[PDB]
Design a protein around this ligand. Structure first.
Ligand SMILES: [Zn+2]
Lengths: 143, 172, 137, 191, 52
RNA sequence: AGAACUGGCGAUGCGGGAUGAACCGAACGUAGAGUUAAGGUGCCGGAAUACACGCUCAUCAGACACCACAAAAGGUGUUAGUUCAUCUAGACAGCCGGACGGUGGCCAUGGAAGUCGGAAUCCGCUAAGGAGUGUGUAACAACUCACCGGCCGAAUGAACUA
RNA sequence: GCAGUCAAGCGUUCAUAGCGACAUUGCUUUUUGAUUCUUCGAUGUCGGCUCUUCCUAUCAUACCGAAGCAGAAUUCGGUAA
């Protein structure tokens, strides 16, 4: 029962780990039972959010290092109050769904995982101008 | 029952034309001399096989010396014993340098705490405990912590003479 | 005053590397090192240099000294020697009053009757020059 | 089983200085200074910094170890008493004869004096302990308030005042008259 | 007479107690054992009885 | 009070059991030297205030066969042990976060919205959150707890034995 | 003769305020028996009077804890001879 219910968790954790390609680790310090409910709705389109006990998660992920191994780099960010938000929709939109909406006095992004990688979500939030000015200043470096 | 040595005792039933070459049985016995050890061998064998020493013989008796008589080990000790009102199994742990050293404190401890004299105890198993923290018992775990140190407060020196011309101190 | 003052008893600790002076037995007189703690009453010691045999000993037949040197716990006799030497333990001991008084007391005890006589005569000489001093300032 | 070491911790707050020598503890803060003899317990103190002092028992059995926390506490309440201070409040409770309570003195002494208890012609006196100071609330009927640096002395002086009104030969569930401790806390830091 | 809250106050002292059944000690109301050595620290306790 | 076998006392001192017919040791010419028995070795008193591991604190401790009595039954005193269960998939404790939507759920009534009370006890979203453990309001608010989490890191709960 | 343990029952309700069956562990030596060790070439019976001392299983008196203690009166219990 108690062994059962834990095992159940690992099950659904694994399932999103295979199904969705990208991953949001969200900090939820404070944050109401109500707030979360409304990020569910706000993302009922694509994203699924999945919360759990850290020691459950570290353990479960580690046992998944045989198949699906880059999740070994997820580990250094499951600490404090955290949860996952899996998605196949793209990047920023979803992040902005998370960060922005149902903020009050919110919940935060702490690191992102996509295709065996590790942003900070500072990266993603990029001005298209550092991308602009680094193909510019180097066509100027060629000129 | 004293300063203990540990012996291999190996014995067997006497040969019959019907069964020459009867099976050999060994016990490890803790005792102080070999007369006790063979006694002890028979006491146990009689409780485990039909044999009295009148139908058997002791084939070999050999002292088993501790292999690493200065490595400190933590031993698991298993014991069966009689109380004034029944009989009990009991697991204890002992930290020491040799089985023979451990067993002797087992006997003092059974005497101190449970008032069990030697006739009343059987040693069931004695075993070095391989991995620290398979150690189960607080009063031995305490010693296993890293960079363990302690003082010995309040030192009393024994005096050689009856009078002393200074008031002593306990300072260590 | 205005700092919190707390004088704390500075006990010699039973610890790996603590050096002890053996009170009793055949190794009576010699230094050995605690290698591993056995319990509140017993320890493994080892005095390769003084030639005291690595053995489990009861703390009551030993006396803790203030000296201690770096020694990994469990260290076998060979590496106890290397370390004891590296540390210059005998050097430190010899320099102590404690070791000096033992030596003094040892030397007195070996004095011949003739020697006892000379110490008398010399003492009487020193005395003399002392009493005239202790009389001038 | 004998615990090879076992220790507790004493936070020293800003502004206070605790100094201990052969178990005689002197604690000094903004409110004043208290001392206490701890010689009757073998414990050893150790100052880590001026914020923090430790107390250990070495190689001690149960009952010894029980002494450890209690030393910590006593020393804690010395520190609290000399920073926040102690305040115990009491209430007179009487069904009929109002309990009439004043301060009186003899040889510059100071007593809490209690009159008319259950209609008694006798007068009750309780010496006011040194260090403890008595007030009477302005806006709670029948209140009485003892305060000072020493919980020990405040609390005992309150106990003395209530024990002196016990009611003898009457069912004490029906006859509930008395002076009872009604609140206890700090001088400084709200109420 | 006597406000409800002071009757309550008085009762923490006078009546919210338990009683040793061997030796009669007035004991703390949530106690498990008698504090007294004469009754063997018995754990045979009962509540002090409430008025009418 | 009365039988069985043996050994004793009686008929027998001696050494020990303080004392003592019968127990323990040992049986007896006059003595010297040595060694022991049973029993002892803080002091009375000849002989270690010897060595070693524990256990015990008694406002009625305890202290040696025969022997100079103590039981049922109890103890959250302290010791060591047993069994069952919880816990590295993170328990227990401590501090700290969350404790939500249908929804003021139907009765009933001056008003009763989780908390006078009758009868029910469902769902959603959950990592979790009772149609509600209490505090509180006139009734809502506010607080609280059950429940889930953060941190910490190896123990925890119960019943028993002697 | 005196005191416990268990707790079915009594006690409007409620085992244990006060009690307490069936059973069961004890204590005492002012009951009475059982025994026949001492004394039958002697140890002067019963009761009272007088007088001293001791025990405590406490009737009164001191201070307490319980209650089916409102008050008064009682009853249970402690330290107490
Ligand atoms: Zn009691």
């Amino acid at each position: 029962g108690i062994r059962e219910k834990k095992a159940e968790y690992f099950a659904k954790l694994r399932e999103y780990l295979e199904e969705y390609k990208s991953l949001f680790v969200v900090g939820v310090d404070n944050v109401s039972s109500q707030q979360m409910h409304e990020v569910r709705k706000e993302l009922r389109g694509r994203a699924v959010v999945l919360m759990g006990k850290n020691t459950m998660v570290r353990r479960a992920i580690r046992g998944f290092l045989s198949d699906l191994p880059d999740f070994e780099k997820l580990l250094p960010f499951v600490k404090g109050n955290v949860g996952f938000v899996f998605t196949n929709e793209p990047l920023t939109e979803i992040k902005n769904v998370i960060v922005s909406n149902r903020v009050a006095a919110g919940l935060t992004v702490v690191q992102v995982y996509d295709n065996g990688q590790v942003f900070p979500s500072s990266i993603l939030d990029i001005t298209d101008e550092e991308l602009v000015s680094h193909f510019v200043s180097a066509v100027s470096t060629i000129a | 029952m004293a300063h203990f040595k540990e012996y291999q005792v190996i014995g067997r039933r006497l040969p019959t034309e019907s069964v020459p070459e009867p099976k050999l049985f060994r016990m490890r016995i803790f005792a102080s001399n070999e007369v006790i050890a063979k006694s002890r061998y028979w006491y146990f064998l009689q409780k485990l096989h039909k044999v009295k020493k009148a139908s058997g013989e002791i084939v070999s008796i050999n002292q088993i010396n501790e292999a690493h008589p200065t490595k400190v080990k933590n031993f698991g000790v298993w014991v069966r014993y009689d109380s004034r009102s029944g009989t009990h199994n009991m697991y204890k742990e002992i930290r020491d340098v040799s089985r023979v050293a451990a067993v002797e404190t087992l006997y003092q401890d059974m005497a101190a705490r449970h008032r069990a004299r030697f006739r009343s105890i059987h040693i069931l198993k004695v075993a070095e405990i391989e991995k620290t923290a398979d150690v189960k018992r607080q009063y031995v775990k305490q010693f296993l912590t890293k960079d363990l140190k302690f003082p010995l407060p309040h030192r009393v020196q024994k005096s050689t003479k009856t009078f002393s011309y200074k008031r002593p101190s306990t300072f260590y | 005053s205005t700092d919190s003052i707390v004088k704390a008893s500075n006990w010699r600790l039973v610890e790996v590397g603590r050096v002890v002076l053996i009170k009793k037995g055949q190794s009576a007189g010699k230094l050995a090192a605690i290698v591993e703690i056995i319990d509140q009453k017993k320890v493994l010691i080892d005095g390769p240099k003084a030639g005291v045999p690595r053995q489990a000993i009861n703390l009551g037949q030993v006396v803790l000294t203030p000296l201690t040197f770096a020694l990994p716990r469990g260290a076998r006799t060979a590496t106890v020697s290397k370390k004891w030497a590296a540390a210059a333990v005998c050097e430190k001991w010899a320099a102590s009053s404690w070791a000096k008084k033992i030596a003094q007391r040892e030397r007195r005890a070996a004095l011949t009757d003739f020697e006892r006589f000379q110490v008398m005569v010399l003492r009487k000489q020193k005395r003399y020059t002392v009493k005239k001093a202790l009389a001038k300032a | 089983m004998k615990y090879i070491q076992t220790e507790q911790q004493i936070e020293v707050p800003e502004g206070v200085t605790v100094s201990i020598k052969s178990r005689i503890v002197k604690v000094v803060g903004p409110r004043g200074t208290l001392t206490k003899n701890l010689k009757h317990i073998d414990v050893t103190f150790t100052k880590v910094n001026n914020q923090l002092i430790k107390v250990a028992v070495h190689n001690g059995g149960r009952k010894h170890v029980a002494a450890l926390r209690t030393v910590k506490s006593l020393v804690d309440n010395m520190i609290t008493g000399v920073t926040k201070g102690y305040k115990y409040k009491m209430r007179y409770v009487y069904a009929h004869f109002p309990i009439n309570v004043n301060i009186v003195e003899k040889d510059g002494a100071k007593f809490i004096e209690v009159r008319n208890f259950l209609g008694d012609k006798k007068i009750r006196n309780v010496p006011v302990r040194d260090g403890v100071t008595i007030e009477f609330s302005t806006n709670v009927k029948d209140e009485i308030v003892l305060s000072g640096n020493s919980v020990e002395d405040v609390s005992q002086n309150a106990a003395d005042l209530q024990q002196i009104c016990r009611v003898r030969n009457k069912d004490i569930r029906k006859f509930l008259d008395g002076i009872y401790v009604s609140h206890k806390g700090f001088i400084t830091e709200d109420l | 007479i006597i406000e409800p809250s002071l009757k309550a106050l008085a009762s923490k002292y006078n009546c919210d107690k338990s009683v040793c059944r061997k030796c009669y000690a007035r004991l703390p109301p949530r106690a498990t054992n008698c504090r007294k050595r004469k009754c063997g620290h018995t754990n045979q306790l009962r509540p002090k009885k409430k008025l009418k």
